A paper describes a structure:
We show that the orthologue identified in [name] (AhlABC) is a haemolytic tripartite α-PFT, requiring all three components for maximal lysis, and we present the structures of the soluble forms of monomeric AhlB and tetrameric [name] and the decameric pore form of AhlB. [name] provides the initial single leaflet insertion, assembly with AhlB then producing an oligomeric hydrophobic pore, and finally recruitment of AhlA produces a hydrophilic fully active AhlABC pore. Structural and sequence analysis suggests this method of pore assembly may well occur throughout the tripartite α-PFT family.
As we have shown that the binary complex of AhlB and [name] is partially haemolytic, the structure of the soluble form of [name] was determined to 2.8 Å resolution in space group P6522 using Se-Methionine SAD, and refined to higher resolution (2.35 Å) using native data. Each subunit of [name] had a very similar structure to that of the Type 2 conformation of the AhlB pore structure, (rmsd 2.4 Å), with a bundle of five α-helices forming the tail and helices α3 and α4 running the entire length of the protein and extending from the tail by 50 Å to form the neck and head domains. A stretch of 16 residues (L155-V171) at the end of α3 and the start of α4 in the head domain are hydrophobic, clearly indicating a possible method of membrane attachment. However, these sections of the two helices only extend over 15 Å, sufficient to span just one leaflet of the membrane, unlike AhlB where the hydrophobic parts of the equivalent structural elements can span the whole bilayer. Within the tetrameric assembly of soluble [name] residues L156, L158, L160 and L163 in the α3–α4 hydrophobic head of subunit P pack against the hydrophobic residues L246 and L249 in the tails of both subunit Q and the symmetry related subunit P’, to form leucine zippers in the head to tail arrangement of the tetramer. Y154 of subunit P also forms π-stacking interactions with F250 in P’, and K152 of subunit P forms an ionic interaction with E257 of chain Q. The head of subunit P’ adopts the equivalent interactions in the tetramer. The other two hydrophobic heads from subunits Q and Q’ are more exposed on the tetramer surface and in the crystal pack against neighbouring hydrophobic heads from symmetry related tetramers. Thus, [name] appears to use assembly of the quaternary structure to hide its hydrophobic head from the cytosol, rather than the conformational change mechanism seen in AhlB. Alignment of [name] with YaxA or XaxA in their respective pores show that [name] is closely related to both these structures, but that the extended conformation of [name] subunit Q is more similar to YaxA or XaxA than that of [name] subunit P, where the head is buried within the tetramer (rmsd 2.8 and 2.7 Å; and 4.0 and 2.8 Å, for subunits Q and P against YaxA and XaxA, respectively, Fig. 5c).
Author numbering:
A (entry chain P), D (entry chain P): 3 to 230, 242 to 267
B (entry chain Q), C (entry chain Q): 2 to 155, 162 to 238, 243 to 270
Write the structure that this text describes.
Amino acid sequence: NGILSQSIANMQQAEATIQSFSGLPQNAVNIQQNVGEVVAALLPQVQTMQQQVLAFAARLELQLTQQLANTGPFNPEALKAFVDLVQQEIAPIQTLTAQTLTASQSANDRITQDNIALQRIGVELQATIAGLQSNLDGARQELDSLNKKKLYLLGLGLLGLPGLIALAVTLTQTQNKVSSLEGQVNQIEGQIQRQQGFLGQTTAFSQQFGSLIDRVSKVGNTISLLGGGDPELARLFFTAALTEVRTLQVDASL
Amino acid sequence: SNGILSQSIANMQQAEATIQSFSGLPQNAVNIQQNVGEVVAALLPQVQTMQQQVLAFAARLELQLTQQLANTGPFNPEALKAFVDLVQQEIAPIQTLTAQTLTASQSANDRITQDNIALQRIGVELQATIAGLQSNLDGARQELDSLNKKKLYLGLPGLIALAVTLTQTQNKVSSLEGQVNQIEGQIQRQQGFLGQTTAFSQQFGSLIDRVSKVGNTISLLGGDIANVARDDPELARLFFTAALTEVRTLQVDASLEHH
Amino acid sequence: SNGILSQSIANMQQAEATIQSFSGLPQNAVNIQQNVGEVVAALLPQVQTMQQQVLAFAARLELQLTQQLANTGPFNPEALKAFVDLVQQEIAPIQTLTAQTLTASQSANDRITQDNIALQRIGVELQATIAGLQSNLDGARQELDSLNKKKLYLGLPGLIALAVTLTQTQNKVSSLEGQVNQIEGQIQRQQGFLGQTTAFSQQFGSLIDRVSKVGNTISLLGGDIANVARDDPELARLFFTAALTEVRTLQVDASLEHH
Amino acid sequence: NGILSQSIANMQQAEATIQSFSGLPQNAVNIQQNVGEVVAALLPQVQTMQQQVLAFAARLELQLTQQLANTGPFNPEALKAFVDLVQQEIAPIQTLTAQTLTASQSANDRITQDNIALQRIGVELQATIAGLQSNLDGARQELDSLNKKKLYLLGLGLLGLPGLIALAVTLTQTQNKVSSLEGQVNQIEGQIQRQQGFLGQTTAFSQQFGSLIDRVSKVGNTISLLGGGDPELARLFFTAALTEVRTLQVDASL
């Protein structure tokens, strides 16, 4: 039903949470910029398109029902002079629609490409962790060993003082190795975390944008049909065009 | 170069701005937004303060202990007793500030967990609801079919009347389509918002764990110092050597920049 | 090369073997396992059968219609009437078998959804429970601290008795640690099992949608044929040309191998 | 508490669901093989280790309490002749433990590496979809346009017959283009789906295996300590060793 309106609203919310991230790679920054432009420029034009499409279709719908009801002389002078009006009225709305479609598809494609790039970076950060975690795990088992050595020696009174002094050097060096490795592993885990949340949002935005483009393409196709004898010619024609305006009010409904 | 405390703080600062970005959510979500707002605005400066105060205390005691150890003569058990009293007095405010910071963090993170669960419960009920509608629609498309089968079956006063039913039913199919997409929208927002809240808590749990390890270290250190007061007064060498390890443990664990 | 029906069937066959691999789960999970077992064992061969029967019927009507269209003379409205009666008779069993297959699929997939929700509800309650224990442990480690602070405070008949408390409390810390890890284990199993069930349903939803589109096409086709019976008997050319498009729509939609 | 037992059980379940997958890339097959070997060979040895560690520690725990209780002449002849027993008893258990540790770490590392490779393939399948989906989307909008053209023409009676025949060629070609593109996109989506579920399982197995290795390293360290005068020497020593056997019964508890 109100799929345009719902898609728009959901796109606005996703955009707001997309702008809220900082310190991300360039591929993310590209999406933040493009998404900015989509919401400030394309979504207003979709709203505009919607109104104009509904206004146009309601007015032609009346006029087609009027023409089905008329009587008097079949007047080929009237049909071509009517049709020409409809092709003229329709022309700029067909343009607005196609333009919207092309620019929307163009923008979505770039988000798709930047998302794939962003996932590539994601898996490569995962690979950097594997190497360092390995080191860390080892440093941590050594540290556990030293911390237990320490409590042992403390139990031995003064006999454990020589052990304890020698031990204290090593503990210091292993605590600093652990500190530095855990520090680096945590920084990278942070990046992955921020990025995965960021891609959640841009995937949600892209899916919504995809529903909007599908509706826009559908509206565009119906318009192409409208935009493109004997008495019971016109009946069948006007009857056929009426069907198309009616699906237009459904397809572009508020 | 930023250490664990400092990365957690900074990660919690970024995640909060993202949590504030979500609108139109249930009360349980708003509870997390304000809670997170107060953590960042008030609790994290406290942690910064505690961290500076722990490092300052560690640097002083480090120095004092090494000068105790550079002593070659025997140890006067009265100066010993007095130094131990001084240290226990300097330990005390720092022990208790760290305990306050740990409690305030646990309580606020415990409320994020609770509100998080309450939100998951809501989310499940949103899926129970989509299922129902989905069936009302599975089933309104059956009504739409047979109402076309029974027309593709077939005077003119049965289709003046059938038309008015048919439209009313497409208006039900569409309406239901709308409703499912609405609810899906809300589910997607909630799942996004819950991913961020979970992330904030993972960061906050790293911070809690670091603050707790610091508390523990102070306690071990307290234990080393006390084992001088009680007490062959050359036992002092051993408990000072051990205390000095705890003091340096502090410096590593609480440092503003890792190694 | 495998088409949509055939990929869905094969994906549903692999996912079922993986769903059967999980043990020690709640009743709601066992309900999905048996349901999925019966889908694969019984409903998917039905779909295979329907698919073969639709293609066979499509190939025959394709031929019959093209030979109607290769006719250059006018059309005898009695042969027309009889051919339409023949086709409506051959349409009928194929329409209804497709409707049966669609219903049996909806009902069984609807029960996977319901059991899925019931399982998510359980999972939420498992998180409410970890939270509680986590607090009982947050809080038993406080008891463990002060019971060490009050010992690092301190004759011998207070520590013969304190020892017996302390151990009893470590036995509570450990026990709780055990309990949290237990429950986490179960959560992880459920989340794994729910990922597979969701995957099975996504596949099953692709199949439902394809079967439904086929049903719809038959219906459009029925509509084209009927519009000959009713009825300038050269209108036959138009409705035969249209029927022939639906017939080929079938062949593409139901084909064992895509294009 | 029972972290060994719980880790083992959870590893057995993950392994069973890991073997249940088929038609996966080589990187998955490697994990299926290694995980097979871990559960049939390493996990039994961990169970064995556990028993022997608990049996050893209970017996030394008794003997240390007995020695703390004894009276009579300080007998250096007895301590070194006691200790030597303990170092001899302990020796093979220290070996079993270290061996277990080394082989476990070795196996986990390979799962980690195969997981990273598997994610790489995952993102590259995602990239293949983007290109084809683009084509598909376009074919589908064309098809929608043709399906609406068809209903239009059918409404025009025989005037729409010429249109309808020409249209039917194009519909056929566009349905076959859609069929083929949707077919290929669905196959790849299937692969990603199976793989993501497969990586869920191997990530769960790897995390459990990581908890087991940490416990095993802890048990190993405590053993190293045990494995490595005046009267109130022995008191302090035996008192120190008792502390270590006690944490061994805790660390390796059933």
